[PDB]
Design a protein around this ligand. Structure first.
Ligand SMILES: [K+]
Ligand SMILES: [Mg+2]
Ligand SMILES: [Mg+2]
Ligand SMILES: [Mg+2]
Ligand SMILES: [Mg+2]
Ligand SMILES: [Mg+2]
Ligand SMILES: [Mg+2]
Ligand SMILES: [Mg+2]
Ligand SMILES: [Mg+2]
Ligand SMILES: [Mg+2]
Ligand SMILES: [Mg+2]
Ligand SMILES: [Mg+2]
Ligand SMILES: [Mg+2]
Ligand SMILES: [Mg+2]
Ligand SMILES: [Mg+2]
Ligand SMILES: [Mg+2]
Ligand SMILES: [Mg+2]
Ligand SMILES: [Mg+2]
Ligand SMILES: [Mg+2]
Ligand SMILES: [Mg+2]
Ligand SMILES: [Mg+2]
Ligand SMILES: [Mg+2]
Ligand SMILES: [Mg+2]
Ligand SMILES: [Mg+2]
Ligand SMILES: [Mg+2]
Ligand SMILES: [Mg+2]
Ligand SMILES: [Mg+2]
Ligand SMILES: [Mg+2]
Ligand SMILES: [Mg+2]
Ligand SMILES: [Mg+2]
Ligand SMILES: [Mg+2]
Ligand SMILES: [Mg+2]
Ligand SMILES: [Mg+2]
Ligand SMILES: [Mg+2]
Ligand SMILES: [Mg+2]
Ligand SMILES: [Mg+2]
Ligand code: NA
Ligand code: NA
Ligand code: NA
Ligand code: NA
Ligand code: NA
Ligand code: NA
Ligand code: NA
Ligand code: NA
Lengths: 180, 399
RNA sequence: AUCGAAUCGCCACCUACAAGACUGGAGCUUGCUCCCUCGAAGGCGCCAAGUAUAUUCAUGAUCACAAGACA
RNA sequence: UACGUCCCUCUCCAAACGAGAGAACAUGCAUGGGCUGGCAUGAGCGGCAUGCUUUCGGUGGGGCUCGUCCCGAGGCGCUGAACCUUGAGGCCUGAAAUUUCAUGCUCAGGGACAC
RNA sequence: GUGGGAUUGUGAAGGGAUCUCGCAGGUAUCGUGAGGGAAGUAUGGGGUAGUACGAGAGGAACUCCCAUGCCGUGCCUCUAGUUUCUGGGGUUUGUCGAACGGCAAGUGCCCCGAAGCCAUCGCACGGUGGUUCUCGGCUGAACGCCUCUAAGCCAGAAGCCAAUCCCAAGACCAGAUGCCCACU
RNA sequence: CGACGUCGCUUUUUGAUCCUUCGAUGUCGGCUCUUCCUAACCUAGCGCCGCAGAAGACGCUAAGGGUUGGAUUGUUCACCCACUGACAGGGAACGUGAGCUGGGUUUAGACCGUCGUGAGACAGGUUGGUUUUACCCUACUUAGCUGGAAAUUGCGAGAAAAAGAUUAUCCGUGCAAAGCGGAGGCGAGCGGUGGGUAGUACAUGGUACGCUCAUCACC
RNA sequence: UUAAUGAGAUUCCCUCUGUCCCGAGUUACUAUCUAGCGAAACGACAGUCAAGGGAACGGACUUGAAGGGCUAAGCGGGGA
RNA sequence: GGAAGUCGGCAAAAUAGAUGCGUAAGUUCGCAAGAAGCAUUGGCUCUGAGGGCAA
RNA sequence: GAUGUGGCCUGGAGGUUAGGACGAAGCUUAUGGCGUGAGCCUAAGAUGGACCGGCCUCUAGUGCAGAUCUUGGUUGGCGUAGCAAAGAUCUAACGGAGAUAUACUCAACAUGCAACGUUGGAUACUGGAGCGGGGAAGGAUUUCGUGCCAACGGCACUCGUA
RNA sequence: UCCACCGGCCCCGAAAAUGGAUGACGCU
RNA sequence: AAGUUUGAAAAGCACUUUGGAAAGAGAGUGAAAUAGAACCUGAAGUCGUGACAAAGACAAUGGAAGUACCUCCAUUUCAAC
């Protein structure tokens, strides 16, 4: 980042103070607009009120007009050193039109990269079950989807992941979950 | 003493280099007529996609007179622009020089992000000192002096306009920093131009205030890019016979012995596409309102079905047209999502075709994914009826 | 703040303009006569702020980039 | 010194590589759901029955055992079903909807210049 | 002056001295437009009209306006081509004991196939002012008269030049701007 | 249009010469592609005819644009079919072979005719007969980075700028007018950013606006 | 003169087709970028043009006109 | 569209197995001949025919 | 093309004079001086380590820029052309110096990459006219075990017909 | 004043292929 | 092809340190390790590095005259000179 935003230059306190200042500015704008739009909508007529659609956060199945979605995210804090999640990877979207004799090794590399980005880990080990599942229709017959179990662990502190196959009958309706 | 044919390509579009900018920029404006009312001459739009229309033709003598025709059209989304500044130009023996800029008292975040590579992590100081200064009495005097200089020395007045990407709530147009262009004010005296521009300051301008429905416009845009291309595609030269040693898709002779060098008129491989073009005489077939105000965008007097300008499944790679838009007859240079400039026409608008009043009878809104055969989702629903998944949904509803 | 320099005419009167087969003005006789601002100077500047009763200059020693220069 | 710029990172209107357009905790990315579309009716099971559809309707040229229950390409039903649908990179979380999106990941961005 | 470096090759440690370099610009937009490139070009039909001319046979052209060649620049709505989305089916031989899932035949082969790319195989768009030639005139001498020229003028070609269009500041733009810094 | 005479011009023919190249400048045609010329076929204007009209002849300015598809032939030339507004003529190392192609030509094999006693010959016919190399420089096409006006240096100062105690000692307007109008501190003014509140406006999440408390600056 | 035979030479017809009109799309391996490895040919000196003369076709000479430096991918006009 | 390409159908496309039917000129009577052409072939469930040993 | 030169230079010989460990020859030079020049001479080596200069005469395999010159070395091109037939590898554990290799800040990503041999598992190929199992010719220790990776195995190696 | 004839300078006669050459600019 | 021609003696670099090793940094021997092993001298050419000179594009080199800056060079002068 730029010099005036570097962690090692500002230090913890100043970085936190600048961060809270930006947040409180955005928050002041959000609350002012919230109050202004609520009262302006209230003192308006039914023809106009319906004319205005979901401005003052009135419509259902909508975002919050006031702020960003990420600013509404509750930051639970530090994830533990040891953590396990189950996730689908859409492999065919990554392997489309790839040379047929490269499909399975490419799938291994794409899975390693996917998990490494997810877990901030460069040591990403493939369990025998996942490698067997990926290769079980030969080099060019990689399945379009795979459900993997990701287990990060520690042994400075060194983090590595173990990725194993999760056999599933269907992929429909499966999202990413945390497993203990 | 040989067989003869014309050369390949137009030497007036040289060099075939990548355009300096991605935005379409007018290199000239229409001749200024002081007898007309002051008016803006340009507007920035975004290409969403294409469809086709049916209309009846009013052209006596033609074999299609009083007959239906179908025309492909291009849909360009036109959210309103915001006027943020005034610039004046004085004429000198070495060309136009700008006298100065009168900035608005308040600018959008979108306009100010245009001054940054990384806005979110920046100090965000753009125009802060200017605001604090112009707000005062010395700043008010400096603004008055700049405006008086415009009145005294300017022959040309332009406004600084920028686009609103927040209102263009498009998910594939990733850019959040506003596009900025100078829009020339034509018509009236210089004082009248300055008055119109001063009234326009910090205000929103809609595309229907610059253009009218049945008129034509010129389009400044950059063409789709293809990277490095060979002479066959880039220039249209013939392919060589199958028997040719070392390759067929090339120019056999790139020159005579003398001059003992290669001329600039010989076709070579290189950049193709991503060029700026000006593309005059595009007829405006419709200036639509945003769907949140008028949702029956594609409804005509002959097709009463309520539908929007967005085809079933959306414009491919673009999404929904959420704002005001312009329906242009035919095609325009450049891909979807690319910002383009509509300019008031420079060619004479006195032909029968260019004056013709356009009345649309049908606007196709079928799916642009795969041979769309339904105009609306209700038409598809009444073709298929209850499917299995709808029955499951109702089964869940009853429990 | 390096930095020592080469350059030696200033101006708020030239720093507007046009014509050279007609240049200040007339006349009728049209190339001569009569009038004038009389047709060939941009203003200063060159050692007393002004034309005179003055007043410090050395030895920087007989040439040397003027050893000095906001006129 | 400060603004800031670039690299790492992410996207694709760019693209041989440079360069470009962008983003910088952002519905940004991921995975689901819905839409839009493609193909053409999946596996399994079954034959007037606890099956299918809402009172109806329910095979097969032949063949084999002891009227029944077996083998049999194919057919019918559940079933416009099953699967695929963004990826070099379709749509929807900002018009309305018999439904019109849901979730979870990010937890002080790192580095170098500017100097 | 300030700072940072360094001298020539035979040890070490301190002193000078002398060189050299930095000491003011960065970064982000909008524009100008000198110079260069340069592009549109043909045919037909309607009507004029079966008329002007002509004994008659025969037999025209422009205002206009309707198309079409070629060339040029693009585009992908449609139609067409293309498929390693090996998408969904189907089908042969072999093969995992069978069904299933498939797999091998360097994409097995066959039908259909989105997206993208793409065809005068599809669709869109292609503009205005000067200045002259050849030549015809006006006024008008030389030279009474005359004369188109000799001094002046006028009209004037798909020519030339500029506009529009493409690149564009080594064309070094004291063009205008945003923000830091330096100067102040 | 032009006898018989006479004067030119041009290097798109062939001859004449033998100056360059024999320690090698790839050799016909076609294909592809670009450019140039005009002695103009078509396209634009204009004169003139024996010019009634239509069709044409001849000339002038004009080279901006255009000038095809095929049968036989290695062919260039030709001449036949057809289209067309027209199917003009030339140059570029008889443009163009590390661009191709290799039909012809021009080695070695072989057949014929003629010639020769013969080996063999033919300026005659016939058939078969390796087409090599670019990663260097320039040129051209695209594609990046980057100094620089004393074209790197001098400190060597020139604005298609303003107009004044010599640009200092205010701001506006006006003709480079005449004048005319504003311009130790506290408080005030004017504003930038935050609280409270109140409509409204704009395309409607996000800015502006009236009142008050806070701070900040400049005056 | 000859049936049969022929990787012999020639002409025509049916079929067929990207040979062509007139090109377009896809694949593998390259080129391309990276790690490791790493040559040769060739090499007077060098490389922007116009005209002129000149051993009668100059990169150097005369007179003009251009030319900021350094680079990546190509390309076959010239380097007779 | 179908050789208009090209010196020249070069290259490529095309034909295709098996079975039945059918097959010209010419001829050294052997051939020509797979001349040319026409048709049929899957999967299932069956039926027929084609044998050997012993009393 | 001819000729001259108390003209220059080199290896040896007869003479005569000198020099050298307090530094000969050789070699280096912004290292000056002298000569029209061939060259000579000095200086300095922060060079060297043992021979050698001048002058007269004698003598010769006696002076180089080029011969598609001979031999050796170097060199731009150039980190370039390229190392593309024979389809192909993946995964864990073990072994190994071959790593999880770090200044401050820093939880891990964004600061040690890339590559190995063995075993297990997976995937594929050869497809009996075989990268199967044995012989002649030819080769002659390449066979086997242990060890070891300097060179060689046009990349790599912990492996090897080294 | 016009008739013929003869000089000077200028003009016509006077068309080629990369953009170009009294050496260049220019000179009346 | 190829002189082993280190040095007077092998006195052929113990020992420390880090590196897997090769080696590096120290320390020793020696008059001298630019005498460290096929090691005397160690040229040219080519290359690296530090300091400096600058320098558009006139290919570079070259001539002649100056000038700016340098000069581990030579020579001369330094007072009745
Ligand atoms: K490499
Ligand atoms: Mg693209
Ligand atoms: Mg060939
Ligand atoms: Mg002086
Ligand atoms: Mg990509
Ligand atoms: Mg909605
Ligand atoms: Mg398609
Ligand atoms: Mg397979
Ligand atoms: Mg030669
Ligand atoms: Mg040669
Ligand atoms: Mg040659
Ligand atoms: Mg060749
Ligand atoms: Mg060839
Ligand atoms: Mg042959
Ligand atoms: Mg034969
Ligand atoms: Mg044969
Ligand atoms: Mg083709
Ligand atoms: Mg290459
Ligand atoms: Mg030349
Ligand atoms: Mg030469
Ligand atoms: Mg070449
Ligand atoms: Mg033919
Ligand atoms: Mg032909
Ligand atoms: Mg063939
Ligand atoms: Mg017969
Ligand atoms: Mg026959
Ligand atoms: Mg048959
Ligand atoms: Mg001689
Ligand atoms: Mg000897
Ligand atoms: Mg000799
Ligand atoms: Mg010689
Ligand atoms: Mg390479
Ligand atoms: Mg196999
Ligand atoms: Mg074998
Ligand atoms: Mg190796
Ligand atoms: Mg002269
Ligand atoms: Na120009
Ligand atoms: Na299609
Ligand atoms: Na198809
Ligand atoms: Na005979
Ligand atoms: Na190159
Ligand atoms: Na020599
Ligand atoms: Na390779
Ligand atoms: Na010692």
């Amino acid at each position: 980042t730029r010099a005036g935003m570097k962690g090692k230059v500002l230090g913890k306190e100043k970085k936190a103070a600048i961060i809270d200042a930006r947040k409180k500015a955005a928050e002041s704008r959000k609350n002012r607009d919230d109050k202004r739009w609520k009262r302006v909508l209230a003192n308006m007529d039914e023809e106009k009120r319906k004319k205005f659609h979901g401005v003052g956060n009135t419509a259902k199945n909508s975002r919050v007009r006031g702020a960003t979605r990420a600013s509404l995210l509750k930051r639970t804090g530090r994830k533990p050193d040891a953590v396990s999640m189950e996730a689908t990877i859409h492999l065919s979207k990554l392997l489309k039109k790839k040379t047929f004799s490269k499909r399975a090794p490419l799938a291994i590399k794409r899975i390693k990269a996917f998990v490494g980005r997810l877990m901030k880990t460069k040591d990403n080990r493939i369990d025998a079950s996942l490698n067997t599942y990926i290769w079980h229709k030969g080099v060019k017959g990689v399945p379009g989807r795979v459900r993997v179990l990701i287990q990060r662990k520690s042994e400075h502190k060194h983090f590595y992941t173990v990725i194993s196959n999760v056999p599933v009958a269907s992929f429909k309706g499966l999202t990413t979950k945390t497993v203990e | 003493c040989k067989f003869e044919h014309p050369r390949h390509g137009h030497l007036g579009f040289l060099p075939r280099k990548r355009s300096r900018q991605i935005r379409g920029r007018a290199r000239a404006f229409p001749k200024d007529d002081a007898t007309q009312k002051p008016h803006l001459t340009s507007f920035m739009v975004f290409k969403a996609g294409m469809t086709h229309i049916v209309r009846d033709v009013d052209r006596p003598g033609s074999k299609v007179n009083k007959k239906e025709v179908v025309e492909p059209v291009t849909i360009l989304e036109a959210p309103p622009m915001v006027i943020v500044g005034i610039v004046g130009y004085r004429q000198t023996p070495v060309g136009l020089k700008t006298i100065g800029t009168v900035w608005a008292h308040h600018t959008s975040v979108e306009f100010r992000r245009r001054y940054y590579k990384n806005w979110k992590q920046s100090a965000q100081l753009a125009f802060s000192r200017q605001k604090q200064f112009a707000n005062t009495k010395e700043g008010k005097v400096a603004e008055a002096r700049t405006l008086n200089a415009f009145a005294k020395k300017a022959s040309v007045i332009r406004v600084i306009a920028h686009t609103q990407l927040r209102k263009l709530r498009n998910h594939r147009v990733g850019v959040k920093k506003a596009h900025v262009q100078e829009i020339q004010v034509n018509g009236g005296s210089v004082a009248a131009k300055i008055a119109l521009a001063k009234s326009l300051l910090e205000k929103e301008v809609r595309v229907d205030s610059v253009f009218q429905q049945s008129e034509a416009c010129d389009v400044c845009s950059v063409t789709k890019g293809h990277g490095t291309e060979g002479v066959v595609k880039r220039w249209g030269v013939a392919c060589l016979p199958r028997k040719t040693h070392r390759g067929l898709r090339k120019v056999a002779c790139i020159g005579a012995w003398h001059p003992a060098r290669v001329m600039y008129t010989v076709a070579r491989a290189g950049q193709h596409g991503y060029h700026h073009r000006t593309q005059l005489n595009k007829k405006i077939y419709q200036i639509g309102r945003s769907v949140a105000v008028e949702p029956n965008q594609a409804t005509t007097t002959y097709d009463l079905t309520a539908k929007t300008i967005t085809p079933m499944g959306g414009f491919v790679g673009y999404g929904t047209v959420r704002n005001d838009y312009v329906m242009l007859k035919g095609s325009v240079s450049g891909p979807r999502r690319r910002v383009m400039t509509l300019r008031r026409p420079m060619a004479p608008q006195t032909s029968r075709q260019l004056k013709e009043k356009i009345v649309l009878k049908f606007i196709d809104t079928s799916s642009k994914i795969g041979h769309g055969r339904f105009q609306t989702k209700k038409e598809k629903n009444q073709w298929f009826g209850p499917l299995k998944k709808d029955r499951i949904r109702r089964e869940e509803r009853l429990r």
